[PDB]
C-alpha cells in the first residue's frame, strides 16, 4: 500500500521543507562498488527415481489420479451419515496394523476428523520408517489419503511428501517387478505427486 508513509504534515514546517528540498536533490539510487563464504541452507531431498523399468506410464498415473477422485467423492457420502484416541501413537499403530489389525472400513475412516487423519498419517509414516511395507499399511495410506480434505495444511503437505520419499527409498530394495510392494509404492507416490500437487516428487 504505502512503502514509506508520510507521518508528518507539510517553524518546524519550515524545517521540513528544507529537508524535503535537500532530499530531492540527493540521488535516488546510489550504487557503490566494492573492490574485491556462503552458508548452506538445508534442503530436503527429492524422490529417488525408479530403477529402470520400474517407472510407471503416464496413462496409468492419470488413470489412478482420475480414479482416486471418484473414490474420494464416495468417501464424502459415508461421512454424511454423521477408535483409539487421537494422541495415541501406540494404539493407532496397533489398531491399523496389529501384531491382525482393523482394515480401513468406511465405517471407521469416515468417522475420523481431519486433525486425526493427519495425526494417523504421521504415526503410520513413523512406523513405516522403522518397519516393513505390508499390504495393510498400504490400504491405510490410501484410505487416509482419500479422507484428507483440501485445501491441505502445509503441515499435511510436508507429511505426505516424506511418505513419498520413504516410498521411493523402499522402492530400491526391490529385485523384481513381481514384488508386491511395487504397485503400491508407485501408486502412493503418484497420488502425492499428482493428486496432491507435489509435482516435484513425480515419477516421469
Amino acid at each position: 500500500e504505502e512503502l514509506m508513509p508520510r507521518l508528518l504534515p507539510v517553524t518546524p514546517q519550515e524545517y521540513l521543507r528544507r529537508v524535503q528540498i535537500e532530499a530531492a536533490q540527493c540521488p535516488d539510487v546510489v550504487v557503490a562498488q566494492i573492490d574485491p563464504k556462503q552458508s548452506v541452507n538445508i534442503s530436503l531431498s527429492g524422490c529417488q527415481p525408479a530403477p529402470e523399468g520400474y517407472s510407471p506410464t503416464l496413462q496409468w498415473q492419470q488413470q489412478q489420479v482420475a480414479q482416486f477422485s471418484t473414490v474420494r467423492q464416495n468417501v464424502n457420502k459415508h461421512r454424511s451419515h454423521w477408535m483409539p484416541k487421537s494422541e495415541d501413537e501406540e494404539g493407532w499403530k496397533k489398531f491399523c496394523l496389529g501384531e491382525i489389525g482393523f482394515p480401513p472400513l468406511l465405517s471407521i475412516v469416515s468417522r475420523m476428523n481431519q486433525a486425526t487423519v493427519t495425526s494417523v498419517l504421521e504415526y503410520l509414516s513413523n512406523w513405516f520408517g522403522e518397519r516393513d511395507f505390508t499390504p495393510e499399511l498400504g490400504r491405510w495410506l490410501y484410505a487416509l489419503l482419500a479422507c484428507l480434505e483440501k485445501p491441505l495444511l502445509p503441515e499435511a503437505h510436508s507429511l505426505i511428501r516424506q511418505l513419498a520419499r520413504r516410498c521411493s527409498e523402499v522402492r530400491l530394495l526391490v529385485d523384481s517387478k513381481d514384488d508386491e510392494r511395487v504397485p503400491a509404492l508407485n501408486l502412493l507416490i503418484c497420488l502425492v505427486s499428482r493428486y496432491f500437487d507435489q509435482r516435484d516428487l513425480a515419477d516421469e
Binding site: 464416495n74 468417501v75 472400513l105 468406511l106 490410501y142
Partner: peptide, 17 residues
C-alpha cells in the same frame, strides 16, 4: 458397501500394467 476403500485400493494396485 462398507469396504469400498479396501476394494478401491486393490483394484488400483491390480491395474498395474
Amino acid at each position: 458397501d462398507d469396504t469400498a476403500l479396501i476394494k478401491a485400493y486393490d483394484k488400483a494396485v491390480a491395474s498395474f500394467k
